[PDB]
């Protein structure tokens, strides 16, 4: 139990006090696997772990043979011993081995081949990985010996994870002998898999569909074993991933999941219901028509008692008007350029809408009534009487901006309260429906389902871009539950975002340091629905901190705050127009001189951002009823804010404005809501050249007051990194599948755009046929995950487009600005553990990289 301690020297004296004591022979065995699980802990070193292995390997076979002939435990113990052979095989990247006479040859080849130059320099990887290949197969007898469950899983997994890193390492080179050994592993992926899983490590199933297309899939391994899956539950979390793939993905291989979906349709019918609708896609050709017709009957297997969905959809449509217009003027115009598509695709985009406008007095919408459209669709029955009856002309693409604008001046008058005349509110339950939300955890768990107990007629509009509309679901289990409305949003990437996010805080559990001081990161449950719509969960008493800044001005310092924003785009926009002629781009490539920039931000960010350093902590005295809980919630304020800069950086930014992650009034805590841009796009993309990793506003550290030394405390970011590196597979294997997979995520992010506006969306797809990375994201992404510092070297390397002016500034700012200020020159582009963070916080408040920036992005 001493080994629990995450410190090191302690387990050294204590091995000695159990190593001496001899009276039992089996005591000394546990002392071995103790000393070697100890060996495993120090293996988090760089060369130290290897050294420990070198020392333990000399004494691992030293007394192991002597102590006992065999044990169920000895065998498992043998498996553990084999485990350290992995610490041997790894690490040497063709480097110069330090001066180790006598010791190296003696154990490099002789201790590696059994159990010179012909086998090492080019082949030591094969010598060592075969000594452990033959050692791991000697962890197969736990499959034949019955026992108490626990030990088999520990090796089952670690067996497999040798082969994932085997296969992706194999995704770099190809030969004939590697392929014969590569034909010995991939059918061994399913065996370590399953084996009556009792503790879910779900990442493995997900990598596997990729394994069925990269080679000729294995029907039998997938047919036999996968029906014996429970040998409860587990049918869930893997929810959406399969249905997409089975219908069209993987051809015939994809079908093996139709025995999956129907070995999982019966139990928990409730969940895929909401998605499988969205997962229609399409079906093609001949041998799949036999199967397309099959799951089309699986569709007939779920429309029963599922006759309630159309009504729900009608209600959402009745609910919004502006979202439809913007999902209309952009989809209509310009997409009729190129080669004209008058096929079935462009005619249905009508039926989604132009049929939702020719039927408000017709049976299409006689079953799903609206009231705003009742007048509007009637005001729209007339204009569509002339605009719709078709056309098929291309010069009128530009003329549709006249009509849209006219109806925009007719769509802003309405949008009023109540809105219980659109019916959907007065939907109720008859004969017990002869409910929203779902549970996706592991384990059986029945009675979990909430039941909808009608709505409340009252509603709330909350103005923000798309103008969403808050909702309180009134519910069965004697409680309520509020929701929000985003019917234009493709809630799918943010879906996996939170999945990857409790992958995150699902690793913050297990580290002694992280757990010690209790440091988790709150997130919620988006619920996507049928691609064209979706809703979102809504906590209480949280708000945008921007309002904690407005109401703290008081009409006094608000007459001094009315113009406070005004101090940027008056005094800062003027300083643009002197840099170059006024416009939208900012002519930021012309923005030159590196000290002039530092002048206007050391001068104007001081004079301005000293007004809200007071105002901030002054919004922090109101929060405080008494002077003792103040040092708890300003405290938890950082407790949260540090877990996000570090976190979002790994994710690919948070890009969240002062209204895009919200603070909670009651207990601080900064759950972040914005998830539009991801990875490098927010800076890699040309339409908006914006660069900064996290956000650290000059008047933020100001809040902490005399927190100038370091920041976030050197505590936050070091517990942070440390938890991120210690287990690779998870965070790693999660993003790697998240990409390359969904068609929306890539090349269709050009389509995810036109969000703010549309002037950005053009000239992207034509200039971005070089945005097909997959292999240059993830590799350079995992070196990010903690394996590399660089930080600066990362961004320049990240952007492909020539940067005559922009690239120099980024390189100049990342290293040059701080390289005469040494925050960026001296940290190596090779490796450093926590150094990269010290500058990471640094390479943000540098007034040089704060100067040339975006307006409204709250850059202070």
Curated annotation (Swiss-Prot):
Residues modified as N6-acetyllysine: 16, 361, 378, 382
Subcellular location: Nucleus; Nucleus, Nucleolus; Cytoplasm, Cytosol
Coiled coil: none
Family per similarity comment: Belongs to the PI3/PI4-kinase family.
G-loop: annotated span: 461-467
Species lineage: Eukaryota, Metazoa, Chordata, Craniata, Vertebrata
Modified residues (Phosphoserine): 464, 554, 759
Region of the whole protein represented: 3245 to 4127 of 4128
Record-annotated FATC domain positions: 829-860
Disease / disorder: Immunodeficiency 26 with or without neurologic abnormalities: A form of severe combined immunodeficiency characterized by reduced or absent T and B cells, recurrent candidiasis, and lower respiratory tract infections. Some patients show dysmorphic features, severe growth failure, microcephaly, seizures, and impaired neurological functions.
Region (Activation loop): 672-697
Domain PI3K/PI4K catalytic as annotated: residue spans: 455-786
Record's protein name: DNA-dependent protein kinase catalytic subunit
Gene symbol of the encoding locus: PRKDC
Function statement: Serine/threonine-protein kinase that acts as a molecular sensor for DNA damage. Involved in DNA non-homologous end joining (NHEJ) required for double-strand break (DSB) repair and V(D)J recombination. Must be bound to DNA to express its catalytic properties. Promotes processing of hairpin DNA structures in V(D)J recombination by activation of the hairpin endonuclease artemis (DCLRE1C). Recruited by XRCC5 and XRCC6 to DNA ends and is required to (1) protect and align broken ends of DNA, thereby preventing their degradation, (2) and sequester the DSB for repair by NHEJ.
Post-translational modification: Autophosphorylated at two clusters, the T2609 cluster and the S2056 cluster. Autophosphorylation induces a conformational change that leads to remodeling of the DNA-PK complex, requisite for efficient end processing and DNA repair.
Highest taxon above the source species: Eukaryota
Region spans: Catalytic loop: 652-660
Quaternary structure, from the entry: DNA-PK is a heterotrimer of PRKDC and the Ku dimer (composed of XRCC6/Ku70 and XRCC5/Ku86). Formation of this complex may be promoted by interaction with ILF3. Component of the core long-range non-homologous end joining (NHEJ) complex (also named DNA-PK complex) composed of PRKDC, LIG4, XRCC4, XRCC6/Ku70, XRCC5/Ku86 and NHEJ1/XLF. Additional component of the NHEJ complex includes PAXX. Following autophosphorylation, PRKDC dissociates from DNA. Interacts with DNA-PKcs-interacting protein (KIP) with the region upstream the kinase domain.
